[PDB]
Design a binder for this molecule. Structure first.
Ligand SMILES: CCCCCCCC/C=C\CCCCCCCC(=O)O
Ligand SMILES: CCCCCCCC/C=C\CCCCCCCC(=O)O
Ligand SMILES: [Ca+2]
Ligand SMILES: [Ca+2]
Ligand SMILES: [Ca+2]
Lengths: 192, 186
């Protein structure tokens, strides 16, 4: 069972590693003003390093290729965060059952309230859509068509889904809420 | 890995099921009045393996003793042979049932008259035979090997810890004349 991960996610994975909180604060200050993506790679790696200690799902080599902003209207934009990582699933007695490529696309919206010189920022929902999590099989020492692979892919999906809901989406919203209203207004500007 | 079985074997598997000791006593009385003894042995061994099923994901049932044979080695000594057959299923976490095996175990000890002496009951790995019948995960891949290895270790530790000692204990309960009468059949 993923009991250990479920209890860990209830507490917050940051209760297992003091450095997550520090990286969060580094991201806050950096956002006031290439490097932000580097700080995000660090935050996500450390969260996944804690998941590696609680589960046999080991997620390494975390990259954020490019953070994009697409204007949805004059006063709203989607903020897009593409994540890649290498995944290996291990079970007791069997050791390494499968190596996967992971793609996660986190999306959230920022809006500015219309008809005011003192605009309020609203950050929308961070939806954990199963279509946003992609797992590709690279290798299994048991054979690619073996049933262990399917169990491996399923276990990885559950872990990744639960840490998107429990950690990444909440921190994505928390980091957007740290932006001053003018900064958001300026960034939603020339998203057009 | 097998901690729970190892702790179980140190206590005695009969501390988990009051019926084992009753079946032991049934076998003792039944012997004094020398199929049926084999039926009591099937029951004793099933129950020991029912306890092992509670301590491990190695489930052993359909336990049979085809025929107990005694071959006279001299006028006052014989080899006593007990063939055991059983169906085995190994389960692991997340995978569930990984393999179904056929188990054959051949226990051998000697009984002599001095005073009855029962010889050692040797746990030879050649005396435990495990045959693959079915696997969800392929017949010759590494899942099966892990399954067969776990079953061997469990069966080996239960032979050493429970079956061989009970085999010796039951033979040592026979009086000298009983053994002389049974060796009577070379
Ligand atoms: C665990 C995931 C946390 C994600 C936190 C994201 C915080 C950063 C948010 C917004 C950055 C500003 C948008 C930049 C748009 C310009 C385009 C570019 O940078 O290439
Ligand atoms: C766990 C194993 C315990 C074994 C206890 C040993 C019991 C042996 C009993 C009697 C031996 C007499 C053998 C005579 C041959 C004919 C018997 C027969 O085949 O039915
Ligand atoms: Ca650290
Ligand atoms: Ca498959
Ligand atoms: Ca949380």
């Amino acid at each position: 069972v993923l009991r250990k991960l479920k209890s860990g996610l209830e507490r917050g994975l940051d209760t297992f590693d003091s450095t997550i909180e520090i990286i969060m604060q580094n991201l806050k200050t950096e956002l006031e003003s290439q490097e932000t993506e580097n700080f995000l790679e660090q935050l996500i790696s450390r969260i996944f390093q804690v998941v590696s200690r609680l589960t046999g799902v080991r997620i390494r080599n975390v990259q954020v290729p490019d953070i994009t902003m697409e204007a949805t209207s004059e006063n709203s934009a989607n903020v897009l965060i593409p994540i890649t990582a290498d995944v290996t699933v291990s079970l007791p007695f069997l050791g390494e059952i499968v190596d996967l490529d992971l793609n996660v696309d986190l999306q959230t919206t920022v809006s500015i309230e219309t008809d005011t010189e003192d605009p309020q920022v609203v950050v929308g929902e961070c939806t954990n859509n199963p279509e946003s999590i992609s797992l590709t099989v690279l290798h299994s020492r048991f054979g690619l068509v073996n049933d262990v692979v399917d169990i491996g892919v399923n276990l990885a999906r559950r872990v990744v889904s639960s840490v998107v809901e429990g950690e990444l989406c909440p921190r994505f919203r928390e980091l957007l809420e740290s932006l001053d209203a003018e900064c958001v207004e300026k960034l939603i500007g020339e998203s057009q």
